[PDB]
Write an enzyme that holds these catalytic residues in place. Structure first.
Site, mmCIF file in Angstrom:
data_model
loop_
_atom_site.group_PDB
_atom_site.id
_atom_site.type_symbol
_atom_site.label_atom_id
_atom_site.label_comp_id
_atom_site.label_asym_id
_atom_site.label_seq_id
_atom_site.Cartn_x
_atom_site.Cartn_y
_atom_site.Cartn_z
ATOM 1 N N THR A 99 -2.724 15.056 70.879
ATOM 2 C CA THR A 99 -1.329 14.632 70.882
ATOM 3 C C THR A 99 -0.500 15.657 71.659
ATOM 4 O OG1 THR A 99 -0.674 15.856 68.942
ATOM 5 C CG2 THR A 99 -1.722 13.728 68.571
ATOM 6 N N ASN A 155 4.298 27.662 54.714
ATOM 7 C CA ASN A 155 4.517 27.712 56.157
ATOM 8 C C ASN A 155 3.696 28.808 56.828
ATOM 9 O OD1 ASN A 155 7.600 26.887 55.009
ATOM 10 N ND2 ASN A 155 6.768 25.692 56.692
ATOM 11 N N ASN A 204 16.246 30.779 54.474
ATOM 12 C CA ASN A 204 16.330 30.589 55.917
ATOM 13 C C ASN A 204 17.332 31.542 56.544
ATOM 14 O OD1 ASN A 204 14.343 28.698 56.166
ATOM 15 N ND2 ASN A 204 15.722 26.936 55.919
ATOM 16 N N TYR A 225 7.083 13.409 56.102
ATOM 17 C CA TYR A 225 5.885 14.192 56.416
ATOM 18 C C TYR A 225 5.139 14.583 55.148
ATOM 19 C CZ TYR A 225 3.334 18.640 57.004
ATOM 20 O OH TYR A 225 2.402 19.663 56.929
ATOM 21 N N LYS A 262 1.370 13.525 53.854
ATOM 22 C CA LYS A 262 0.344 14.472 53.426
ATOM 23 C C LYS A 262 -0.100 14.190 51.989
ATOM 24 C CE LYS A 262 -1.174 17.326 55.247
ATOM 25 N NZ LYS A 262 -2.360 17.511 56.162
ATOM 26 N N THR A 308 -0.369 20.842 52.273
ATOM 27 C CA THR A 308 0.872 21.616 52.323
ATOM 28 C C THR A 308 1.482 21.764 50.937
ATOM 29 O OG1 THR A 308 3.215 21.538 53.172
ATOM 30 C CG2 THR A 308 2.031 19.465 52.953
ATOM 31 N N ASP A 309 2.182 22.883 50.722
ATOM 32 C CA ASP A 309 2.903 23.033 49.464
ATOM 33 C C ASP A 309 4.087 22.084 49.339
ATOM 34 O OD1 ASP A 309 4.693 24.182 51.265
ATOM 35 O OD2 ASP A 309 4.878 26.086 50.172
ATOM 36 N N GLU A 310 4.470 21.402 50.407
ATOM 37 C CA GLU A 310 5.633 20.539 50.305
ATOM 38 C C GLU A 310 5.346 19.226 49.582
ATOM 39 O OE1 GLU A 310 7.846 20.437 53.995
ATOM 40 O OE2 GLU A 310 7.618 22.619 54.244
ATOM 41 N N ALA A 343 5.416 13.310 52.079
ATOM 42 C CA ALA A 343 4.927 12.138 51.362
ATOM 43 C C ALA A 343 3.644 11.615 51.985
ATOM 44 C CB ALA A 343 6.001 11.046 51.346
HETATM 45 N N1 LIG Z 1 1.931 24.669 60.385
HETATM 46 C C1 LIG Z 1 2.214 24.918 58.966
HETATM 47 O O1 LIG Z 1 3.078 25.644 58.624
HETATM 48 C C2 LIG Z 1 1.322 24.227 57.895
HETATM 49 C C3 LIG Z 1 1.440 24.632 56.589
HETATM 50 C C4 LIG Z 1 0.626 24.035 55.628
HETATM 51 C C5 LIG Z 1 -0.291 23.047 56.061
HETATM 52 N N2 LIG Z 1 -0.374 22.660 57.322
HETATM 53 C C6 LIG Z 1 -1.391 21.643 57.656
HETATM 54 O O2 LIG Z 1 -2.238 22.263 58.417
HETATM 55 C C7 LIG Z 1 -2.885 21.112 59.419
HETATM 56 C C8 LIG Z 1 -2.771 21.631 60.836
HETATM 57 O O3 LIG Z 1 -1.493 22.251 60.975
HETATM 58 P P1 LIG Z 1 -0.999 22.817 62.452
HETATM 59 O O4 LIG Z 1 0.267 23.699 62.346
HETATM 60 O O5 LIG Z 1 -2.131 23.460 63.116
HETATM 61 O O6 LIG Z 1 -0.580 21.395 63.244
HETATM 62 P P2 LIG Z 1 -0.411 21.198 64.852
HETATM 63 O O7 LIG Z 1 0.810 20.287 64.983
HETATM 64 O O8 LIG Z 1 -0.267 22.529 65.585
HETATM 65 O O9 LIG Z 1 -1.802 20.499 65.395
HETATM 66 C C9 LIG Z 1 -2.136 19.210 64.906
HETATM 67 C C10 LIG Z 1 -3.474 18.833 65.592
HETATM 68 O O10 LIG Z 1 -3.929 17.709 65.133
HETATM 69 C C11 LIG Z 1 -4.226 16.795 66.397
HETATM 70 N N3 LIG Z 1 -4.081 15.414 65.903
HETATM 71 C C12 LIG Z 1 -2.969 14.823 65.474
HETATM 72 N N4 LIG Z 1 -3.269 13.577 65.077
HETATM 73 C C13 LIG Z 1 -4.583 13.370 65.237
HETATM 74 C C14 LIG Z 1 -5.451 12.286 65.014
HETATM 75 N N5 LIG Z 1 -4.961 11.004 64.475
HETATM 76 N N6 LIG Z 1 -6.734 12.435 65.289
HETATM 77 C C15 LIG Z 1 -7.189 13.573 65.787
HETATM 78 N N7 LIG Z 1 -6.397 14.620 66.019
HETATM 79 C C16 LIG Z 1 -5.102 14.551 65.763
HETATM 80 C C17 LIG Z 1 -3.310 17.148 67.278
HETATM 81 O O11 LIG Z 1 -3.739 16.753 68.688
HETATM 82 C C18 LIG Z 1 -3.178 18.653 67.107
HETATM 83 O O12 LIG Z 1 -4.033 19.413 67.854
HETATM 84 C C19 LIG Z 1 -2.213 20.009 59.203
HETATM 85 O O13 LIG Z 1 -2.963 19.172 58.194
HETATM 86 C C20 LIG Z 1 -0.860 20.428 58.526
HETATM 87 O O14 LIG Z 1 -0.332 19.431 57.799
HETATM 88 C C21 LIG Z 1 0.350 23.224 58.274
#
Ligand SMILES: NC(=O)c1ccc[n+]([C@@H]2O[C@H](COP(=O)([O-])OP(=O)(O)OC[C@H]3O[C@@H](n4cnc5c(N)ncnc54)[C@H](O)[C@@H]3O)[C@@H](O)[C@H]2O)c1
Ligand SMILES: NC(=O)c1ccc[n+]([C@@H]2O[C@H](COP(=O)([O-])OP(=O)(O)OC[C@H]3O[C@@H](n4cnc5c(N)ncnc54)[C@H](O)[C@@H]3O)[C@@H](O)[C@H]2O)c1
Lengths: 324, 323
Positions: A41, A179, A249, A150, A154, A126-128, A152
C-alpha cells in the site's frame, strides 16, 4: 532451520522485526528462512528491506487473497501478521479499507493458517481496542471499547482470531502495544511527521487541547515483546507490551521541539480530532513474567530516531513530498 | 400525509425484523400509527417475503444489500429511524464457513453506519445478541461486560457492535446497540432450536436433546424483544448498549420438557446427541430503568408459537425441504 512468514513485513514495525530476525538479534533464531508477504500500500516500502534483500523471499500479495495464501503458507513454522491499515486519521476520513484489511483480512489469514496447519500464529494489535482509562492500566482481561474506526477494526480482527482459537483450536496469540516510534516509520505518524516537517522548516500540528495521554515504546522493544510471545506464549492468549514513557500530547510536543531544536512558532493549533480517547495504558505484568523487559529509555530512543531521520533524507524526502 | 416518522428496517424480511415491521404497521406502539416503512433485505436463504404478505400496502420493499453504499445513499434519506436486523444468524453455518458472517455482520454494519452518517439519519439501532459475551455459568451480565465471543458468528456480531460504537464516539452518530437472548415465535426459520424441534415432531420425526441437556440460555418472545427495541428507539441514548431480557432462563433439559408439554408430545421422540457455550444470562437494569419490562410469560408464548407452526405447514414445509 525455522521458517517465518511475516505479513505486512515491508511496513514500519514488520520490517524492523524482519531486519532484527535476519541480523540474529533473537538468540537461537539464526539464519532463519524468512518470507515477507506485503501488498505494498502507500505505507509499504521495499527500501525498508533493502539491507536484507538477499536474505528474504518477498511475495507481493494481499492477506485477503486466500488462494495466494494457500500456495505460500505451507512449510512455515511461524506466521506474524503486521499487515493492517494503521493511520487513525485515514480511518476517520473513510473506514472501508480498515474493515477490509483489519477484519476480513484477519479472517482470510486465520482460515488459510488453519488449512495450512501453521503451528504458531501471532496477530499484532493495539492498546486502542480498550478505550480510555483515567487511572491505572488495563490487563489482558479488560473489556473492548474502541473509539476510532481504526481501533474498532483492529478489535474486530482480534475477536475473529480468538474465535478461531476457541472454535477450531487455532494456535493464534494476540499482542497489544501502545504507540511505536523509531527508524523507517512512515512520516504520517506524529513523531516522524514532526521531525521531517521541522527539519524542512515547516509547520507541525497540535490537535485539540493536547491533554490526551499516550504510551510510547521504541519499535525494537515492541519486537522483543513479540518475539517473547513467539517463543513462550500460549495459543488463544492475549499479551500486552507496555510503554516506557507516558506523555500528554502537549508534553510530547515539547519533547519533540526540544529534540530537534524547533520553536513553538512552528506548532499549528488544529481543532478537535473526534473521539472519547483521553488515555490509553497497558499493564504487561503477564509478559514480563515470561521474561520480557523493555530496554530503550524514551529519551535515548527519541535521540536515535532524530539522528536517523536527520541522516536519512534520501529515505523520507520522497515520502514527505507524496504526503505533500 | 401526516408527520409520523418514516422507519427503515434492514433485514426486515427475516424472523425478528418482519415481526417488528408487522407490529409497527399493526399499530402496536402508541403514537406510531400510519408509519411508512421501507424494508431493505437481500433475501438470503433466510429471507422470506411471505413474512410480510399482510402489510404490503404500508411497506416499500427494496431487494438489496446493506453493503451497497450507493443504494443506501439513495434510499436512506427521509427516514427518521434506521434499524439493522440484517445478518447471517446460524451459529452452525458460521462454523462451516465464517466469511459471509464477517461481510454482512461487520462490513455491512460499517456500510450502513457510514450511509446513515452522510444521510443525516437521526435515530439508529444496531440489533445484536448476548452471544458476544461468551459463556457465563456464574450469574448474569451488564452492558459493561467484556466481550469473549466463542463462535465466528458471535465474533462477527461483536465486530459489528464495535464499529457502530466507534461511529457514535467518533462522529456523534446517533446509534444505540441492543443485545438480547435467544428469540422464539412465529415465522422463525426451522433451522433454529425451537422450530426445528416443533417441525420435526409434527412430521413424526425424532428431535434432539443436546448432550447432558445442561446448557442454559435466556429465552425471549419475539414480541418482547421488539417492544424492548422500540423503547431504545424512543428513550435510549446514542452510544449506549442496552440489554433486553426475557422471562425464562432454561437448561436445554427444561426447554425440552416445556416443548413436549406445549405440543402434547412424549419423551419417546427425544434422542440424546453429543454436545457450544454453557450459559447466557442477561440483566436489563439499564433498559428497565427506561420503562421496559418483558410481558410474555414463557409457557404462554410457547403455546402460541406451537399454535402458529401447527397452522402454518404451507409456510415451513418448503423450508424443511432443506434436507
Ligand atoms: N505504529 C504503531 O504505533 C502501532 C502500535 C500498536 C500496533 N500497531 C500494529 O502494528 C501492525 C503494523 O504497524 P505499522 O506501524 O508497521 O504499520 P504500517 O502502516 O507502517 O505498515 C502496514 C503494512 O501493512 C501492508 N498492508 C496493508 N494492508 C495489507 C493487506 N491487505 N495485505 C497485505 N499487506 C498489507 C502495508 O503495505 C504496509 O507495509 C499493524 O497491525 C498495526 O495495527 C502499530
Ligand atoms: N434469532 C435470535 O435468536 C437472535 C437473538 C439475538 C439477536 N439476534 C439478532 O437479531 C437480527 C435478526 O435476527 P433473525 O433471527 O431475524 O435472523 P434471520 O436469519 O431470520 O434474518 C436475517 C435477515 O437479514 C437478511 N440479510 C442477510 N444479509 C443481508 C445483507 N447483507 N443485506 C441485507 N439483508 C440481509 C436476510 O435475507 C434475512 O431476511 C440479527 O442481527 C441477529 O443477529 C437474533
Amino acid at each position: 532451520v525455522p521458517r517465518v512468514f511475516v505479513a505486512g513485513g515491508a511496513g514500519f514495525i514488520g520490517s524492523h522485526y524482519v531486519r532484527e530476525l535476519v541480523a540474529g538479534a533473537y538468540a537461537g533464531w539464526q539464519g532463519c528462512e524468512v518470507t515477507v508477504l506485503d501488498s505494498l500500500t502507500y505505507a509499504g516500502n521495499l527500501a525498508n528491506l533493502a539491507g536484507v534483500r538477499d536474505a528474504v523471499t518477498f511475495v507481493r500479495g494481499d492477506i485477503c487473497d486466500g488462494r495466494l495464501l494457500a500456495e505460500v503458507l505451507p512449510g512455515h513454522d511461524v506466521v506474524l501478521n503486521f499487515a493492517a491499515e494503521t493511520h487513525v486519521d485515514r480511518s476517520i476520513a473513510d473506514s472501508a479499507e480498515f474493515l477490509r484489511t483489519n477484519v476480513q483480512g484477519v479472517q482470510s489469514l486465520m482460515q488459510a493458517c488453519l488449512t495450512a496447519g501453521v503451528p504458531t500464529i501471532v496477530q499484532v494489535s493495539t492498546d486502542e481496542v480498550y478505550g480510555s482509562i483515567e487511572a491505572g492500566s488495563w490487563s489482558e482481561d479488560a473489556p473492548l471499547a474502541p473509539n476510532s474506526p481504526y481501533a474498532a477494526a483492529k478489535a474486530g480482527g482480534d475477536l475473529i482470531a480468538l474465535a478461531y482459537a476457541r472454535t477450531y483450536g487455532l494456535p493464534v496469540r494476540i499482542t497489544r502495544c501502545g504507540n511505536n516510534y523509531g527508524p523507517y516509520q512512515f512520516p504520517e505518524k506524529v513523531i516522524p511527521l514532526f521531525l521531517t516537517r521541522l527539519m524542512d522548516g515547516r509547520s507541525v500540528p497540535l490537535y485539540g487541547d493536547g491533554r490526551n495521554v499516550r504510551d510510547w515504546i521504541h519499535v525494537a522493544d515492541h519486537c522483543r515483546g513479540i518475539q517473547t510471545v513467539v517463543e513462550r506464549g500460549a495459543s488463544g492468549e492475549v499479551y500486552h507490551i507496555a510503554g516506557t514513557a507516558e506523555l500528554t500530547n502537549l508534553e510530547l510536543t515539547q519533547h519533540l521541539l526540544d529534540a530537534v531544536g524547533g520553536s513553538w512558532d512552528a506548532v499549528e493549533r488544529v481543532p478537535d480530532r473526534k473521539g472519547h480517547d483521553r488515555r490509553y495504558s497497558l499493564s504487561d505484568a503477564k509478559l514480563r513474567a515470561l521474561g520480557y523487559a523493555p530496554r530503550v529509555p524514551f529519551a535515548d530512543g527519541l535521540a536515535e530516531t532524530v539522528a536517523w531521520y536527520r541522516a536519512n533524507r534520501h529515505w523520507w524526502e520522497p515520502l514527505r513530498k507524496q504526503l505533500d
